């Protein structure tokens, strides 16, 4: 029973590998050799946000590129104004440990999640001026790792029980579930058209999940160790993953195999957060060795470095208009970086 | 523009109120100590929960000193990702029983994995060895459950600096300090970490456990301040 199924699985995997080898038309570096390089990118810190006491674990920008939500391990969820370094809101948290935070595209809701296995959604529509728990969500057994808003009524949520979920915020139950992982699902990234999304997990593979159908379409196995972060290229066709083996990998959906490996010999520490720019030319990767790196996405060369954090960089975020880059680290500081000329 | 000045004034007032709230919460956060009650499995850690969702919280104060103790409840056995979130705790209370598959060796491997972790180098570990009466009955029964699992127990002598409890078989005392020397060897072999281990032998029903945790946490805090003042 087991033997024929394992042999059939090995034959199907060999067929998929042969199809990926046959569809390998050329190499991205060989056709991007005739591209002018970006050069040295020198970014300077414009603002520095100092409200959190405990280490800052995750952040998320707003769609107006004005307000940003940051979560710390002391039980504090602070909505910052990025221009004047003023804290618009401070929210106490029921659970001390928080591993994810999200800001709604409408701007009215803020979600958080951590080791309590409960996603807490807070509303900013309150006439009293005081924040409140709009809805708590408890359907995951493993620890909660990532959550991102589709809209005001639905939310895609990642947990450590090898599952992903689509929750209806109005009813309070899971609209659907996604069960395709053998490892802890570390992060998710939503597509710009919100038709698909991707999930990066600890099984050294990334999944392309379909929202309406509920099954994974594409599986990408190119990493050696646990994948920590994932983000889309801004068209929705490609995506980049960072892992613990000190290598970033840019995968393509339609090519159904990896395009490019970003690696350096002197860099041996892990990766925590990756994010593209507005155009997609720069890949911004927050490494474990106390700094960030600005890779050229076409030439695979280190265009810049952002060594501004005393402790490791936990999270990284880029505005929608592409104006500033905010990095949150474990030294209880938020650094906003912008280029100068 | 007067409207921009009014909005900026209201934003500054809200920022001052939030900074006053954070300065009121800062002393409450920094005065309170944090404990991670971690066990390998069926070790009777629920006895420590009764005496001393996903995570369980126990609040207890000794001499106006506040302790939050966090027990890991309904979580997946893959520990390699969330344990980094416990880097900044004051202590990791590692509770295992000295008494199917071998459990002492998995306990030694788990303690080695906690100790050799690069982010857990700052965090110190307080060791508790439970079920001393069950270990004593296992030794007095005559069945070989530590010579078969460990060959070093045959060529082992009781340490002279060890203080034995009166009324015990010296074979039980020898097995106790043998397991204690195994944990001390694993803790000592690293060396580079700036943290220390505290072994403690505890029976099934004890009262002195909270006092031992308080004394060990006071020792950790005083060693941290002496390390900051470069005296150690």
């Amino acid at each position, epitope marked *: 029973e087991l033997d024929q199924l394992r042999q059939e699985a090995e034959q199907l995997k060999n067929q998929i590998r042969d199809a990926r080898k046959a569809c390998a038309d050329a190499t991205l570096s060989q056709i991007t050799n005739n591209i002018d390089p970006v050069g040295r990118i020198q970014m300077r810190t414009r603002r520095t946000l100092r409200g959190h006491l405990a280490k800052i674990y995750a952040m998320h920008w707003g769609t107006d590129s004005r307000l940003l939500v940051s979560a710390s391990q002391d039980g504090k969820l602070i909505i910052w104004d990025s221009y004047t370094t003023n804290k618009v809101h401070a929210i106490p948290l029921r659970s001390s440990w928080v591993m994810t935070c999200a800001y709604a595209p409408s701007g009215n809701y803020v979600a958080c999640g951590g080791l309590d296995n409960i996603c807490s959604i807070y509303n900013l529509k309150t006439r009293e001026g005081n924040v409140r728990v709009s809805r708590e969500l408890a359907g995951h057994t493993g620890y909660l790792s990532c959550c991102r808003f589709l809209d005001d009524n639905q939310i895609v949520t990642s947990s450590g029980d090898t599952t992903c979920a689509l929750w209806d915020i109005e009813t309070g139950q899971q609209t659907t579930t996604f069960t395709g992982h053998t490892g802890d699902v570390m992060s998710l990234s939503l597509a710009p058209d919100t038709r698909l999304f991707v999930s990066g997990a600890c099984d050294a593979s990334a999944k392309l999940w379909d929202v309406r159908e509920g099954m994974c379409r594409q599986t990408f196995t190119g990493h050696e160790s646990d994948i920590n972060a994932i983000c889309f290229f801004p068209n929705g066709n490609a995506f980049a993953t960072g892992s613990d*083996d000190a290598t970033c990998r840019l995968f393509d959906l339609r090519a159904d195999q990896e395009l490019m490996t970003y690696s350096h010999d002197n860099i041996i520490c892990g990766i925590t957060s990756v994010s593209f720019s507005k155009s997609g030319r720069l890949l911004l990767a927050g490494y474990d060795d106390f700094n960030c790196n600005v890779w050229d996405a076409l030439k695979a060369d280190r265009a810049g470095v952002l060594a501004g954090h005393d402790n490791r960089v936990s999270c990284l975020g880029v505005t929608d208009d592409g104006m500033a880059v905010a990095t949150g680290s474990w030294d209880s500081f938020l650094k906003i970086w912008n280029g100068s000329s | 523009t007067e409207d921009q000045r009014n909005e900026e004034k209201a934003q500054r007032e809200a920022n001052k109120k939030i900074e006053k709230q954070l300065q009121k919460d800062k002393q409450v956060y920094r005065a309170t100590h944090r404990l991670l009650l971690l066990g390998a499995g069926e070790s009777g850690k629920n006895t420590i929960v009764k005496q001393m969702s996903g995570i369980f919280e126990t609040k207890f104060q000794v001499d106006k000193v506040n302790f939050h103790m966090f027990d890991v409840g309904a979580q997946r056995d893959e520990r*390699r990702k969330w344990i980094q979130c416990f880097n900044d705790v004051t202590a990791i209370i590692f509770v295992v029983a000295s008494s199917q598959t071998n459990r002492l060796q998995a306990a030694l*491997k788990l303690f080695d*994995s906690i100790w050799n972790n690069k982010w857990l180098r700052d965090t110190s570990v307080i060791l508790f060895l439970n079920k001393q009466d069950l270990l004593a009955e296992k030794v007095l029964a005559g069945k070989s459950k530590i010579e078969d699992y460990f*060959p070093e127990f045959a060529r082992y002598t009781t340490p002279e600096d060890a203080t034995p409890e009166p009324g015990e078989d010296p074979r039980v005392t020898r097995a106790k300090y043998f397991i204690r020397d195994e944990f001390l060897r694993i803790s000592t072999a690293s060396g580079d970490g700036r943290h220390y281990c505290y072994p403690h032998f505890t029976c099934a029903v004890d009262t002195e456990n909270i006092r031992r945790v308080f004394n060990d946490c006071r020792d950790i805090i005083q060693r941290m301040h002496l390390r900051q003042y470069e005296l150690l």
Partner: nanobody, 128 residues
Framework: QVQLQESGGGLVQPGGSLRLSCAAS????????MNWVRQAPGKGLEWVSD????????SYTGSVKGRFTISRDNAKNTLYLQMNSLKPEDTAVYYC?????????????????????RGQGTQVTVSS
């Protein structure tokens, strides 16, 4: 894709000899500490022995200490376990496992139920 393929085992006599091979594909072999896990019939997983990146740090479970020989080969990309003077209590399913992070001394969850990087394993029966 990280894959590990075990080879060797089967039905042996008590006190006999046996050699186990572990072929590694899909990663850089020399940068990972690796180890062996066994599963007895009717029991859970437990650690057996390990080897570091270079091969200097070698440790065993004390029930089989002095009886097994672990040896890795980085150039031929193969882990080996030599097992002589066996006992009937050593019949088990054997798992060649890799620690998940490179350039680290610690191995957190190798002995876990749904660990994703261990191999399929091999059967060894040491019945008389």
């Amino acid at each position: 894709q990280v894959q590990l393929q075990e080879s060797g085992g089967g039905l042996v006599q008590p006190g006999g000899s046996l050699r186990l091979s572990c072929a590694a594909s899909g990663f850089t072999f020399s940068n990972y500490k690796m180890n062996w896990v066994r599963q007895a019939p009717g029991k859970g997983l437990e650690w057996v022995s390990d080897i570091s990146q270079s091969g200097a740090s070698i440790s065993y479970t004390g029930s089989v200490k002095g009886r097994f020989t672990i040896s890795r080969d980085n150039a031929k990309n193969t882990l080996y376990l030599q097992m002589n003077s066996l006992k009937p209590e050593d019949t088990a399913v054997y798992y060649c496992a890799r620690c998940p992070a490179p350039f680290t001394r610690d191995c957190f969850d190798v002995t876990s139920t749904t660990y994703a990087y261990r191999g399929q394993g091999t059967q060894v029966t040491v019945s008389s």
